[PDB]
Each structure stands twice: as structure tokens, then as C-alpha cells.
Design a protein around this nucleic acid. Sequence first.
DNA 1: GCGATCACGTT
DNA 2: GTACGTGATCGCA
Length: 580
Amino acid sequence: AKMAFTLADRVTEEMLADKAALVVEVVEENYHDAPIVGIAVVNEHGRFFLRPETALADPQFVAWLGDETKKKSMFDSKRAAVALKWKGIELCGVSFDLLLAAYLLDPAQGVDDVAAAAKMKQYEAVRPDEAVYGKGAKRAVPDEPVLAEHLVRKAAAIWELERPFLDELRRNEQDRLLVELEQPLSSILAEMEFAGVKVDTKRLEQMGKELAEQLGTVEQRIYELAGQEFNINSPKQLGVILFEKLQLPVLKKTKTGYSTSADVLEKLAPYHEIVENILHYRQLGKLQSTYIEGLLKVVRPDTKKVHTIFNQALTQTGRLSSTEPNLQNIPIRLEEGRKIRQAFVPSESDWLIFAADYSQIELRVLAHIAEDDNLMEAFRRDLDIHTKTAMDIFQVSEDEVTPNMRRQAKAVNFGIVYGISDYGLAQNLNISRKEAAEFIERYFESFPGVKRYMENIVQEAKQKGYVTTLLHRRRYLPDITSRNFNVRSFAERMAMNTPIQGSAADIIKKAMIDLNARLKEERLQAHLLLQVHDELILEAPKEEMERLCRLVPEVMEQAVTLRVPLKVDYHYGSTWYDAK
DNA sequence: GCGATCACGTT
DNA sequence: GTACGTGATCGCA
Ligand SMILES: OC[C@H]1O[C@@](CO)(O[C@H]2O[C@H](CO)[C@@H](O)[C@H](O)[C@H]2O)[C@@H](O)[C@@H]1O
Ligand SMILES: OC[C@H]1O[C@@](CO)(O[C@H]2O[C@H](CO)[C@@H](O)[C@H](O)[C@H]2O)[C@@H](O)[C@@H]1O
Ligand SMILES: [Mg+2]
């Protein structure tokens, strides 16, 4: 049964009450400089639909939008805030974001529209966005009558769902998590996205030349060594050449054919010279397709900046994700790829890039949560944790630790955080399963606190049905009770890892909020550009570097107080690559 | 035009 | 063994 609402041709005073559910619709997935197709307002006086041209040109409405005392309840306020920033309009007073509330209540639901969130509370008087707009090539904004009813219904759902969601958040002790952490972070992320990062396109185009050239050489070398030409980018075609024509040994299978992953190829290299060339081709081709051509496709031609979109309500652990482009996976490990970062430059003349990253935050959080005496003392002495672990598991003094012993202790440390598995560690170190189990057993002997935590957290997950982080974020793990060994085992690793990865996420999010408050108090022009899970990237005038060198690390180190210190390394330079 | 696979980049 | 996003190929319209 249709929903009553006024299709306003002009903005009236009752539309500007100090409390309302607000819908500022942006249909385009990427909301940067995107159109706002309609507006809906629901308050004590009724339900309204306003045409964007009308509303956004009305002085009273714009003032209402920017008045922090006029509270708004929305779904994905960041989308609206950024679309409005591009139109030179400021959105303030958003006191409740249904998307973030739904996300905190249960990240697993994958709530991506008002309808999905509403379903959580048995409210179904609203259609999924996809049913209204369609998807793919058939996506499109419907006629006004249909559009207006959909927006009003979403505003109505939001108006109705606010109390129920806040009630459950409070019961879960997650009310401060939404109000003091996620919602304020949303506004910071919006400023970061809108600001964007400047890209030196000329530098990228030149790198693309060099790559395309040497890639052509390796491509030919590969055909010579194979005795014919084929699509190297085709796992199927490549498998034929390697495991059939060249008779290379099949050490690993995928499921539709042979595995040609770098992990396997590394082992096959000694058998034929084609393997190394294929690996090199794989490296170059990745940089060319994903980072050179890929970036160049999303740089704004007018400003030469890339404007990422941080998905704040997607990961099951509380970490942010980044898209179009994904700026949280720009090469750093290998030098050839690392040079891609020379393309990310300050947006203004005489400004520099400043980056600060937490050193081993996940292992430090683990030491804190597990209260492992050995591990806490190690960080208190600021020891090389990998060398210390090698010393303990292999029972030797520091001087007796060989590089290979450190490499393996390091691999054990990463496994411990991800949810240690004798099978997973074995694959990682290319060793026996029994040998891996022995390393793990030795580790727990040295860190009884970590062992106790791993055992206790799994039982707690089974008892309560979920695990939590420092700031009360939670992740339900129903598979923890499954009778299928594999399904259950994965759930157990999640129980071990989520509190760690999750608490590290909580901490850096808090540091971001604290940092922005400090920057404003000090009236610095410095501002956040990106966040890559455990690090923060900013840009600022060169004259602000010395101050940032003290301010940024301190804010990040003081975000939360743990049983062990939090350590922050920092660097700055003319490009992201130089901020090393 | 789409979606399941494959691969590989980050933490 | 965590947690992600993107690109090339290929089976099917
Ligand atoms: O606006 C980001 C916010 O929107 C959701 C809602 O579905 O995702 C949409 O927008 C993202 C950014 O363009 C896309 O990656 C995604 O595919 C699209 O559905 C939320 O998941 C997200 O938090
Ligand atoms: O019990 C020994 C040891 O086994 C683990 C393996 O992850 O858990 C198994 O045994 C528990 C009983 O103590 C069950 O609750 C759990 O479901 C089963 O997988 C460890 O957690 C535990 O320390
Ligand atoms: Mg680091």
C-alpha cells in the first residue's frame, strides 16, 4: 500500500525541523562529482520529496544542511557528504548512520542498502536499491513517481529504525563505538576522499613505456624457449606449454587444471629457463596492467588526482578497504614495483609527503591481550621480536641466530597472528607438517600466555557465539560449532585473529580522529591523504615537517594505552616513494 | 554483457 | 593460515 508524502516544488519551514531522516540520493556507485538524483526528508511534520535542483539552490535548505544543530539520520552519510562537497555544499549534524550501525551490529550481513539493514529488524516496507535501479547495463534512475516513493520509503525506514538499532548497540556496549569512533571517522574519510592524491601522470606514462618495452623482450624470450607462441596470460595455455610440451613436473594442481602460481613456478625454475622468464613476465605484466594502465584510467584529467572511496562497512574485522583505485595495495616489497610510488606526489608546490606507520602493532596488541610475560618484556625492551622468537624456539643466544632461523621465526610470528596452523605454516616454509607442528609447539613453550589466549579465545567464541576487540567491535562465528573439521577450523582461526587484527584497526581509527583534532588545534595545513591499515599518509607544507615529526608519532602512540608501548616509525619526502 | 577462475598486489 | 580489490582469460549467452 503506497506511502503518503508531499512532492514539494518549493522548500518549506517544516522541512527544516531540527530532527529528520535524510536521503540525498547518489545512484552512481562512484559518488565523486556524481549527480544527486533526489532528496527525501521525513520528520515530525511529515514526509517530503524535493527535486535536487530546487533544494540545493535554496539558501534555507543549504543552511539547514550545514547547521550542526539540525540533526540528521541517514544511510551512508559519507556518500552524501562527498557528493555534496563536490557541489560546494557542507553537510553537518549527522547523528546517526544506519549503514555504520548495521555494520557494527553484524559485519557478516553485508548490509549495502537500507532494505538489508531494515530486514534486520523485520521492517520490509522498503525495496532493495537493486530492485528499483536494476544492475549492470540495465541500471538507471526511474521516473519521478517511482524514484520519489523509493526515497521516501528509505527515509521512512531510517526514521523508524534509528531507536531499535541504537537500543541494540547500547546493549552490545557498542554505542560509543558508533558515536565516538565510526561516525566521526566517516567525516574524516570524506575529507580524505574529496581531497584526493595528486598523481604524476607523465612519470607513470614513462614507466609504462619502459615496462612495455622490456615486457616485449621477455615475451619473445618466452616464445623462443617454448618453441612456439601462446598466451602467457592464460593459465590454461601456459599449463599446456609447461606440463605437456616441456614435460615439467606437476607438483601442484588447482581444480580445473595445473597450478601456475609463483609459488609453484619458483620450484620449477631449476628445470627450465622458461620458468624464470615467465615469473619476470608475471611481475612486469602485473605492474603494467594493474598499476600503470589501471591508475591512469581513474586519474581525474583536470586535477590529475585520484579520489579513492574507502569502504568503511565491509571487512569482517573492522579494517577499511579502498577502491577505484585501491590505494592500500600499491607495491612496496619489490623495488621495481615500489617505484610506482614515485608517481604519488604532494598536491601543492613546496609540500611534502609524510608517512607514519605502527611498528608490529598486531604483535604488540597480541602481547597486550594475551598478557604474555615473555612477549611483553620483549617489546618493553624494544627487542627485534623475530630474532627473539628465533632465540626462544631454537634455544640459542642472539649471536647464534642465523638469517634462516630469523626468517622461519618471522614466518611463525605471522602465522601466530593469522591463526596458527601446522598445515599453513608447513606450506609457507615449504617444510613438513610434522616439522611445522614442532616449531609451533616450541613457540607455545616460550610464550605460554599466547597459548593460553589462543585456547581461551576459541572457547569464549563457542560460549558467547562471537569475539570482540578492544573497542567492542564484534564478529559472530557460528561455524565455531560446526562438526565439519575444516569449516570449524577456519572459524577457530578467525576467533584467534579477529581480536588482534580488529583491535589494531580500532587503534588506528582512533589515532586518525585524535590526529585531525590535533591538526586543527595547531592550525596546521597538514592533512590526511591515505590510511593503509597500520600506517597513515599525509601531505603538508615543507615548513610543517619538523612539527609533524613530533606531533604525528605522539598522537598515534597515545591513541590507546596498552601493557606494552606502541611504536611509530615515520619518514617524509617529495613523493610517497621517498617517504621512506 | 556476466560471472567463475586464475593470478597477485597490500597488511 | 588473516583481511582485502583488480585484471586477463574463458565458458555462455
Ligand atoms: O558508498 C560506499 C558504500 O556503499 C556501498 C553500498 O552498497 O557500496 C557501493 O559503493 C562502493 C564504492 O563505490 C562500491 O565498491 C560497491 O560495489 C557499491 O555497492 C557500501 O558497501 C559502502 O560502504
Ligand atoms: O582441546 C584441545 C585443543 O583443541 C582445540 C583445537 O583448536 O579445540 C578442540 O577441543 C575443544 C575441547 O577442549 C573444543 O571446544 C573445540 O571445539 C575443538 O576444536 C583447542 O582450542 C584446544 O586447546
Ligand atoms: Mg609497519
